[PDB]
Amino acid sequence: GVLKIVKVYLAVKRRIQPGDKMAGRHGNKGVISKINPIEDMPYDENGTPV
Amino acid sequence: FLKPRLVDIEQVSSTHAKVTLEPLERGFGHTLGNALRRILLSSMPGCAVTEVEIDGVLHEYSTKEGVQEDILEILLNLKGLAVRVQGKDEVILTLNKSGIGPVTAADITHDGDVEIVKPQHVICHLTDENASISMRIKVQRGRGYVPASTRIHSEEDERPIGRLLVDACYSPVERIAYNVEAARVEQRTDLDKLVIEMETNGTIDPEEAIRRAATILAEQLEAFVDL
Amino acid sequence: TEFLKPRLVDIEQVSSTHAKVTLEPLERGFGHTLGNALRRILLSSMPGCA
Amino acid sequence: GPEEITADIPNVGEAALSKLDESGIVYIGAEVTGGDILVGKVTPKGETQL
């Protein structure tokens, strides 16, 4: 019944957003809540944020 | 209500430097350093490559025969190319090169406002004797982080299928740190200093930056002054 | 590189001593950058006769 | 009747048919978003009875 088929291949690039699941190898899960600016990140004396 | 002013601005590397502010009253060293760290790290002028149209490439996911870097990776390398302009808000640089060897950032076509702060920055390698890559690299200037996604809304017939967009990286600043050491001026009870150690890709000079920072700072207080 | 300015500033009086002012159009991170820089100088350096 | 892959689609603008070639298939490399037509297809339904 099918005369012809056209298959299109889309490549989507997704980065990260609130709602994604993240975990370490140690069984600590997590879901990113807020994406915070580098300005509000806790930093050490050297000034490098986390 | 004694006011501050700048003092010796000590360049160390082409990357970073330690600026200093001598006349700070009680506790004001912190009140500034954090407020200055904020505007330094976030809102600053920068020029990052935006639109790139390459030789035979339809999309960022293909491979050009004769170069071992995937097109996606070459776009990513461009996001990290540091340049600076003077009088232009967008300049289109034409890059051409061939032959076996690294293609660096010094092989491009120089323009009146073009200054390449890292001529050694690697765009990609070249694996064959005769293979040639031509690219139109459209660099514009702006503020903040504009990802490639939010750019395809205007669109308005960006039909140039070869014009691959990248994410806007716009910012000079890398790491800003402030340390307040007690500064003893010959006569005063107790005063403090401001040591602002910042870090940059070399596309903005320290005195220019720290000035425009405080500019925006006081500019928002404008409304605040009255009601 | 033009820089967004605030607007609207409804000042809700709470008697005669204190009040809650509000500012709607503050860009990224500027709410803290202002709010904190003002909290600092208000609590510490101000003219007073005590 | 048989279904056509033809690029002639009732009720679509020039902006819609831009991204498609003469044959009705989207060009390779064209960036797309929600609502874009990947493959034009049309099926017979006769005597609409309006």
Residues spanned by CATH 2.170.120.12 within chain B? 46-170
Nearest residue, CB atoms, A48 vs list B38, B147, B175: B175
Q: Are the Cβ atoms of B161 and D29 closer than 8 angstroms? A: yes
For chain A, the residue count is 50
Query: Class of the B46-170 domain?
Result: mainly beta
Q: What is the dihedral of CA B59, B65, B66, B72, to 10 degrees?
A: 20
**B42–A contact, CB cutoff 8 A:** yes
Strand B83-84 vs strand B10-11: parallel, antiparallel, or unpaired? unpaired
Shortest alpha-carbon distance between residue A1 and chain B (Å) = 35
Residues of chain B with Cβ-Cβ distance to C40 below 8 Å are 27, 30-31
Structure tokens at B9: 């601005």
Across the interface, do C36 and B34 touch by the CB < 8 Å criterion?
A: yes
Q: How was this structure determined?
A: X-ray
Question: Cα distance from A18 to chain C (closest Cα, Å)?
Answer: 18
Residues of chain D positioned with their CB less than 8 A from the CB of B152 = 31, 33
C23 token code pair = 């500012």
How far apart CA B112 and CA A44 sit, in angstroms, is: 41
Within 10 Å of residue C35's Cβ, how many Cβ atoms? 12
Minimum CA–CA partner of C30 in chain A: A39
How far, in Å, CA of B103 to CA of B95, rounded?
10
User: If you write DSSP's letter for every residue of C1-50 in order, what string do you get?
Assistant: ----------EEEETTTEEEE------TTHHHHHHHHHHHHHHSS-----
Q: Give the DSSP H/E element, type plus range, for residue A2.
A: none
d(CA B14, CA A50): 25
Nearest-neighbour CA in chain C from A24: distance (Å): 30
Nearest Cα residue in chain C from B226: C9
What is the C-alpha to C-alpha distance for residues D18 and D36, in angstroms, rounded to an integer?
A: 10
Which of residues 2 through 31 in chain D touch B, CB cutoff 8 A?
18, 27-31
Q: The sheet that has B173-179: what strands, in order across it?
A: B10-11, B17-24, B192-200, B173-179
The reply to whether residue C28 touches residue A37, judged by beta carbons under 8 angstroms, is yes
Superfamily of domain B1-45+171-227: RNA polymerase, RBP11-like subunit (3.30.1360.10)
The label of the residue with tokens 């790139």 reads: B52
Helix (H) or strand (E) holding A29: none
CA distance B1 to A36: 36
Q: Where in chain B is the domain with CATH 3.30.1360.10?
A: 1-45+171-227
Q: Which of residues 131-150 of B touch A (CB under 8 A)?
A: 147
Interface contact D5-A10, CB threshold 8 A: no
SS3 string, chain B, reads CCCCCECCCEECCCCCEEEEEEEECCCHHHHHHHHHHHHHHCCCEEEEEEEEECCCCCCCCCCCCCCCCCHHHHHHHHHCCCEECCCCCEEEEEEEEECCEEEECCCECCCCCCEECCCCCEEEEECCCCCEEEEEEEEEEEECCECHHHHCCCCCCCCCCCEEECCECCCCEEEEEEECCCCCCCCCCCCEEEEEEEEECCCCCHHHHHHHHHHHHHHHHHHHHCC
